[PDB]
Amino acid sequence: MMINTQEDKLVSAHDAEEFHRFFVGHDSDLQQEVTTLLTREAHLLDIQAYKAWLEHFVAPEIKYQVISRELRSTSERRYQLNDAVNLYNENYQQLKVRVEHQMDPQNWANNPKIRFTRFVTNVTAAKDKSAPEILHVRSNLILHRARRENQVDVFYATREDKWKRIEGGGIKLVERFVDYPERIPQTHNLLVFL
Amino acid sequence: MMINTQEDKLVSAHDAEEFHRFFVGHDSDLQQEVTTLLTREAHLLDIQAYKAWLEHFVAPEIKYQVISRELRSTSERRYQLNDAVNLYNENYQQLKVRVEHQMDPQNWANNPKIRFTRFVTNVTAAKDKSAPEILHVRSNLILHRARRENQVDVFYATREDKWKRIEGGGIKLVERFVDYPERIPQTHNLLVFL
Amino acid sequence: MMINTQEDKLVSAHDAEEFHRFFVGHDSDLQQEVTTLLTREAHLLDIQAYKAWLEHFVAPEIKYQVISRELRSTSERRYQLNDAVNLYNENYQQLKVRVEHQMDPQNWANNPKIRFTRFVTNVTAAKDKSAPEILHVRSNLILHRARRENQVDVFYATREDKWKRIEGGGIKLVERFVDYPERIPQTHNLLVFL
Amino acid sequence: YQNLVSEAGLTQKLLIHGDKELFQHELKTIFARNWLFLTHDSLIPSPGDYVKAKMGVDEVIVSRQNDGSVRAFLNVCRHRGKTLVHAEAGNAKGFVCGYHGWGYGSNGELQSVPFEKELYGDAIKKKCLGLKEVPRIESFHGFIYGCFDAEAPPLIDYLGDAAWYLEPTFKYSGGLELVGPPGKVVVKANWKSFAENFVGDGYHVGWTHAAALRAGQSVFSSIAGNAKLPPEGAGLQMTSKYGSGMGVFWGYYSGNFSADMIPDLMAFGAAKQEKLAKEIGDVRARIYRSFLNGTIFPNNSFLTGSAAFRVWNPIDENTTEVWTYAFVEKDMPEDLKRRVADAVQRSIGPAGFWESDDNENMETMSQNGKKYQSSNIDQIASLGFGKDVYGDECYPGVVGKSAIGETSYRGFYRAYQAHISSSNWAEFENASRNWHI
Amino acid sequence: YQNLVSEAGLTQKLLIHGDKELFQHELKTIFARNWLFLTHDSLIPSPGDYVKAKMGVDEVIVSRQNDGSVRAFLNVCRHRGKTLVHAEAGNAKGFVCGYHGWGYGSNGELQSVPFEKELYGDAIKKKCLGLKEVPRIESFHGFIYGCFDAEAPPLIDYLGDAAWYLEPTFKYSGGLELVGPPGKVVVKANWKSFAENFVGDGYHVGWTHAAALRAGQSVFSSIAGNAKLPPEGAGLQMTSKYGSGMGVFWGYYSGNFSADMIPDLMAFGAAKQEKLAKEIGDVRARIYRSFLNGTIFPNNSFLTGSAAFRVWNPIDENTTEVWTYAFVEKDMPEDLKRRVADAVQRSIGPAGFWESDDNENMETMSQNGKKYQSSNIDQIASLGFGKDVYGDECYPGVVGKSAIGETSYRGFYRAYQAHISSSNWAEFENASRNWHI
Amino acid sequence: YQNLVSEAGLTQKLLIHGDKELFQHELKTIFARNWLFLTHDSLIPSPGDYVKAKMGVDEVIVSRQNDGSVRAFLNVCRHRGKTLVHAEAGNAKGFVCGYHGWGYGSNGELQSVPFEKELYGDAIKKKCLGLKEVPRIESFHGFIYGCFDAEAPPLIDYLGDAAWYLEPTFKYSGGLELVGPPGKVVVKANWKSFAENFVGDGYHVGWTHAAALRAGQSVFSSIAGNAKLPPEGAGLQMTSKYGSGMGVFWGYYSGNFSADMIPDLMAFGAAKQEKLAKEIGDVRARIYRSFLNGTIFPNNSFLTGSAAFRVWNPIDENTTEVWTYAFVEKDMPEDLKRRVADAVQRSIGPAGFWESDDNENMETMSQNGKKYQSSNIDQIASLGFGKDVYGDECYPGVVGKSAIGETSYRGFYRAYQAHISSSNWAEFENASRNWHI
Ligand SMILES: Cc1cccc([N+](=O)[O-])c1
Ligand SMILES: Cc1cccc([N+](=O)[O-])c1
Ligand SMILES: Cc1cccc([N+](=O)[O-])c1
Ligand code: FES
Ligand code: FES
Ligand code: FES
Ligand SMILES: [Fe+3]
Ligand SMILES: [Fe+3]
Ligand SMILES: [Fe+3]
Ligand code: NI
Ligand code: NI
Ligand code: NI
Ligand code: NI
Ligand code: NI
Ligand code: NI
Known part of the structure; x- marks a missing residue:
């Protein structure tokens, strides 16, 4: 099933082809495998096992990217300056640094221990048509972060991932991309692993 | 499994029989099929492919209904005036009109492009006992809508659907009913496809 | 897969072993069975069929516990006073009392009828290694409660359950534990069945 | 201003x-001064029918009386000030407060007081504790308006x-x-x-x-x-x-x-x-x-x-x-x-x-x-x-x-x-x- | 009023x-004037034990002293006014501010100031920068109350x-x-x-x-x-x-x-x-x-x-x-x-x-x-x-x-x-x- | 104060x-008085380029003029006060209000008014209805600041x-x-x-x-x-x-x-x-x-x-x-x-x-x-x-x-x-x- 972007005036060419990708790529076995993968990943992050996540779930070649897109007019084509800022755009070393900041006993923000709860839904998956070891994964996330008695922040995101099968049976993240839907988050910060 | 509505004083006869319907109607294959269907539908709506949705996911005979129920006393039986207002009660032509309003370049509200994220959970399904081409579907939805930098609205709903199998293998919506749970939504409007 | 708690400085020994439990305990059949179970349970609660829930989904030996943990310094080990208050810590009789309060026609708070919507995600399950009739279940819950026109409360929780298989094919809850993530909920009360 | x-x-x-x-x-x-829309006859067509309405930020109960007239009252108990009615519409010949059980008629009168005989005796005058009434209620072809100010012009004159x-x-x-x-x-x-x-x-x-x-x-x-x-x-x-x-x-x-x-x-x-x-x-x-x-x-x-x-x-x-x-x-x-x-x-x-x-x-x-x-x-x-x-x-x-x-x-x-x-x-x-x- | x-x-x-x-x-x-409940002896039973409490809208640290007495202080650093303590209860002989590192004793005294020797010298008088203390702390059979007003009656008289x-x-x-x-x-x-x-x-x-x-x-x-x-x-x-x-x-x-x-x-x-x-x-x-x-x-x-x-x-x-x-x-x-x-x-x-x-x-x-x-x-x-x-x-x-x-x-x-x-x-x-x- | x-x-x-x-x-x-940062030349490098900026709590449209200069205007229509621009940045030679269709130039002038001939005639003077302009706009090596107060010192003097x-x-x-x-x-x-x-x-x-x-x-x-x-x-x-x-x-x-x-x-x-x-x-x-x-x-x-x-x-x-x-x-x-x-x-x-x-x-x-x-x-x-x-x-x-x-x-x-x-x-x-x- 395909989208006609001449008639469907709100749909980007990018989103239309992604939709088609995931439509034709449906596989029942893959759906259950990837659902399990993302549930394990989310559990690991919720209990703040960041080193285990980085070592076991994230590939050396990782690009971990979360953008905030400047709001532009749908009819203003002429202005061509970069429309996206990278809230995250991290390689493995950069994730390592963030992880080591997280568990340092002198990270004042982490005391008392913060509470995370992740809700992963709408999982879809498709094997890459060229590189069959690559799995394209889409999933939606609600992330609840609570701390300091009465601070509550709720994040909402669609994660567009590429995962890679590893020798031995593991699966590791090689790219995560999030186009964060709120231009100005009202959450104090976005210092969470989406 | 059945509910005894004489002992279960808070349960309506309607809800009790619906529960039984979905309990005995459980089928593993159907569960995965309908989960895929609703995930595809939600993806299509999130990327604002409204024409593709109306053409490919919605049947000509569609009744698309979202009510707001007036709050009445559980013990006040005598007052019999209509207790529900139709926020939506649309046939195909009426959906067509709403869709064409959506993608018109002079829809001022849609510029800059609004961001939608849908979270579908608690999917259940049951084949109709008379019309086997009809699938009864229940699912819960969280819909996040973000626009204009700092506007965020979150909708919560249970969709009670009838879907129909089509010649060729497709499945199209013939009825969606939502009893919207907040009597006075604090979301500016309810102009979203639940 | 295991977590190294010497390197993963934020992870409790308790959470690390639980993660391992659910990792090695993965079974596809059990996943679908338990997902169906929790979806049925949530539907039953959403329609306020509390007697049916207590009779059919809850075991006589039930411990139903929801704690609020006092915020303590991650480095302050010496202070040993109890760090958890039981918001719920109920046996079957205590649940019975709460259920009978719920459906009493003189429960003023329940008029007009309150609206509940439950979203269950991230289900995992593992058969107990000693007692195979016992199923360990973890799931995340968003619970939306709406009443009185403009009151909306949203609860977020991870339920750590033990369920037991019954003669005849049923499955009943023998323990539910929730470590409620917000120390001071801003929800008026927590009088909901998580 | x-x-x-x-x-x-x-x-x-x-x-x-x-x-x-x-x-x-x-x-x-x-x-506080002007005519404010309440409801239409067709929404409270029978004796005892009521709707809740807002008059500015305040809430009133608008009630069809046994004699066919309409009266409206602030939705507030005269004891400790609890909101009296939580339904948006219904039918009732009276309204009981869920706090201590004071019971008012659909005419706003305080009719029943639990423990009146045993504990109140003459320490209570029910005639002084009726619901606070909206003093002006008029209609325009079935459309009923209320006004907090007894000095307001008649509704028809106000429409001018x-x-x-x-x-x-x-x-x-x-x-x-x-x-x-x-x-x-x-x-x-x-x-x-x-x-x-x-x-x-x-x-x-x-x-x-x-x-x-x-x-x-x-x-x-x-x-x-x-x-x-x-x-x-x-x-x-x-x-x-x-x-x-x-x-x-x-x-x-x-x-x-x-x-x-x-x-x-x-x-x-x-x-x-x-x-x-x-x-x-x-x-x-x-x-x-x-x-x-x-x-x-x-x-x-x-x-x-x-x-x-x-x-x-x-x-x-x-x-x-x-x-x-x-x-x-x-x-x-x-x-x-x-x-x-x-x-x-x-x-x-x-x-x-x-x-x-x-x-x-x-x-x-x-x-x-x-x-x-x-x-x-x-x-x-x-x-x-x-x-x-x-x-x-x-x-x-x-x-x-x-x-x-x-x-x-x-x-x-x-x-x-x-x-x-x-x-x-x-x-x-x-x-x-x-x-x- | x-x-x-x-x-x-x-x-x-x-x-x-x-x-x-x-x-x-x-x-x-x-x-600002009345006696406000803080905690009970049994929640701060040992030297260095503390709890956070609210006194009206303000927050105080209530601390068991080494000599067995109890003192309480506004939970606010005397440097730039950062909140000092984020745990609800614990045990500590002092409290360090996470902003610049000023360290106070459990007695509220400013004890340590990073770069004191190198940058402050006599531009700082630590004795003038102790935590703001609650001036009145009294108990009723283990139940400890605080008062911001030094002129308040003794707690026992206040209970009357x-x-x-x-x-x-x-x-x-x-x-x-x-x-x-x-x-x-x-x-x-x-x-x-x-x-x-x-x-x-x-x-x-x-x-x-x-x-x-x-x-x-x-x-x-x-x-x-x-x-x-x-x-x-x-x-x-x-x-x-x-x-x-x-x-x-x-x-x-x-x-x-x-x-x-x-x-x-x-x-x-x-x-x-x-x-x-x-x-x-x-x-x-x-x-x-x-x-x-x-x-x-x-x-x-x-x-x-x-x-x-x-x-x-x-x-x-x-x-x-x-x-x-x-x-x-x-x-x-x-x-x-x-x-x-x-x-x-x-x-x-x-x-x-x-x-x-x-x-x-x-x-x-x-x-x-x-x-x-x-x-x-x-x-x-x-x-x-x-x-x-x-x-x-x-x-x-x-x-x-x-x-x-x-x-x-x-x-x-x-x-x-x-x-x-x-x-x-x-x-x-x-x-x-x-x-x- | x-x-x-x-x-x-x-x-x-x-x-x-x-x-x-x-x-x-x-x-x-x-x-209302001081110099406030707007944008840099490199973000509005071409004629018609604009960015939205805040000046305190107010929002302004900062626009590159056809002559290469920069002007800024409150983001508010002069008719009924609707916000004029919702994009954060773009290129346009004018801005049309979505309410009734008044059209302004990138220079803030009211240029087009629907039904001007048919309904306004001389009841409208467009020259009096241009966007409210920020009276002072100056730069420091490409960094552009605005000031609501015409009496402010030059930006360079203000940097002192x-x-x-x-x-x-x-x-x-x-x-x-x-x-x-x-x-x-x-x-x-x-x-x-x-x-x-x-x-x-x-x-x-x-x-x-x-x-x-x-x-x-x-x-x-x-x-x-x-x-x-x-x-x-x-x-x-x-x-x-x-x-x-x-x-x-x-x-x-x-x-x-x-x-x-x-x-x-x-x-x-x-x-x-x-x-x-x-x-x-x-x-x-x-x-x-x-x-x-x-x-x-x-x-x-x-x-x-x-x-x-x-x-x-x-x-x-x-x-x-x-x-x-x-x-x-x-x-x-x-x-x-x-x-x-x-x-x-x-x-x-x-x-x-x-x-x-x-x-x-x-x-x-x-x-x-x-x-x-x-x-x-x-x-x-x-x-x-x-x-x-x-x-x-x-x-x-x-x-x-x-x-x-x-x-x-x-x-x-x-x-x-x-x-x-x-x-x-x-x-x-x-x-x-x-x-x-
Ligand atoms: C008399 C009274 C007053 C407040 C609370 C309760 N209670 O919960 O038992 C009883
Ligand atoms: C001295 C100083 C002041 C504000 C911010 C930083 N920083 O982030 O490097 C450094
Ligand atoms: C002239 C006018 C004024 C308000 C609303 C509408 N409308 O919706 O048709 C029309
Ligand atoms: S507040 Fe209504 S009876 Fe007491
Ligand atoms: S604010 Fe506490 S040390 Fe500076
Ligand atoms: S408010 Fe802008 S044209 Fe009327
Ligand atoms: Fe009480
Ligand atoms: Fe800093
Ligand atoms: Fe209009
Ligand atoms: Ni994409
Ligand atoms: Ni490891
Ligand atoms: Ni139904
Ligand atoms: Ni098509
Ligand atoms: Ni646990
Ligand atoms: Ni039963």
């Missing part, structure tokens, strides 16, 4: 849509010259029914932003709703893009002494409804128009099947044709609880009544595709009124200025020759300014002595 | 539960005639333990709405909690439906000069607990009652195993029997952070202590099935106090009025012969009005010279 | 970070002695580019809390960011734990007449960036330093490749080296919309520019691992300023006090010999107090006559 509106209501300070202290002042001087325009639909058409329940939604805009839009904003339709016109093919497509006036003529706009006003778009009986509603509605209206012409004359029979958009001061608005009845219930200076009813003519076929009720919500209810367009107009105007520099900008209500007439042979009140006009904005804001600068009705009257000149 | 409460505390303006400016005024005249009623449980029973941590939840009600309910609301139990009584079969089932007084008698209610008051329901040692708690608790209380009668007499030994509901002015409430200790921490005029502890008698078996701690939360904690019932009583009263028209309605506190006595041979204070009564509401609100109309303790004393007459 | 800051800016009342009425007063006396310190990076390095779009996030802190931190808080780096220093191995690791001063020396801090100030940490061109950025950045800076020394001298060439942290009064902050440009946009007394840009030197390789842009967000953007640390410093300081007792605590800005100089041969302004110092806090708060106690620029000047003495 002086000079927030200029002479002849020509300009308004943007701040009025965002100022917190002014909002508090409005509760004392607009909402506006009543003449309302009568073809409200009085002469054989009776209306208000169809409940209303749509309800909260919008982050000041109540006045909606009130001004409905009192006279023919100008916005072709621009704000351009996409909606194209999609639904409403009769208002004639003014799409604000390119041409209606082929029927520019229409009329009027205002009145106590601030109510409206526009008239000739012949547009289907209003903001889409093409699927037009043939059946137009046929119904044309048929009754022919009968009505013989009773009330050609012009007024035409008004009957025209589109009127107006506001009954302060915060009740309506559309005829695409039959809507609205209340802009204030919550705070940047927050309004918007109520949307449909109304129908009693002698319409029942199927047409149902179609009309749904079509109203479809255009302007909480999920209305027209009303959505309006959100950002209303909300940003109000938010700009909160901002320091922007709040000092004037809104201008100059459309038609210098060409309004009074004492026309046919059309009463202050009248302009276009429904795309700001005649009724000027009247609305004149009355508004007169009220905020007055302490009572007598002072309003003195401030309004030369309203039409 | 005068005349918000009428003579003898008979009526109160509903507005007091919703007015924003009055709330600000209360911070200056109620919370209320202390006599508290002593059987608090003093003579062999010691209490406060069981932490407390339940905490935010409720959209004014702090006073809870304070008045706990000071004297025997009247609500049979009505508000009718369903809870049926379900749990609490001893309070005797007054279900407000149909009959307790077979034991109407009980007592008392009030005192500085505003504290309470009711007594004879013999109801199990209070709001369900049937499963009754036999074991009743047996424990009856056994100690027999011993206590020989030390303090029959009446006071009976008080020991009775249900007392009260408020220690302004915002600390308690129940004996169903042993609860509550703090209504103000957030704003329509928002309160509600804390719920259980307390136990030290010589109870440990299993019974645990059962009591859980049973308190079960009835009145954040998920308490009784407390839920109360939400709408408290919240709507407070919300109605915000509404323009409704805020001018009076609350009436007339139950028992004209029959209170002072100087009774047995029962001290101002006393009424019913726990279903408003004696203690009247005393609470008299003290409240005296405080809001006074600038200091001396003026309160002058306004309270004839409190019992 | 007098005495909120003590002489020489030595102490500040904590309340200033939480008081609502003071915030309103700041809109009148800080934000601060300009000398900025010139090596801003003027002499061959041009900068501001890299958009900015990160944006809302933080529950007062705008002043960020402004004071950036104007002079070298002291916090080693303590607040201890974990970040260990993890990323920034050059600032030298001051980790506030244990030792930098091996390069204590650095400098300066302030100026109109309140702008900054610190200098010698040689720290890579700033808050992690080890992976250091070699390439240091090599680039060292190479240009060698060239610059011959043009502007050794000291100033060293400043070029040093870390400057500062605030351009009131609410624009920057870091050089780890090139960041920040705006603390006020929302209310406890809420700020924080904007974060990177800047780059125009002659950097494009890959290095991209790496710098990402590295800025990585440390201090909405997901920045350093900026996270800061949240609780800023937010709790501001929240404590709201609390009754805590708001009366003084913040102290005493670091370096008694040792600042004026008229130094090399370093202009009021200068202290440490970047770990509060010289610039004192200057910031002196200017702040002078403004809040003044009605206009003339009064500020009189209050500032002896600023350096």
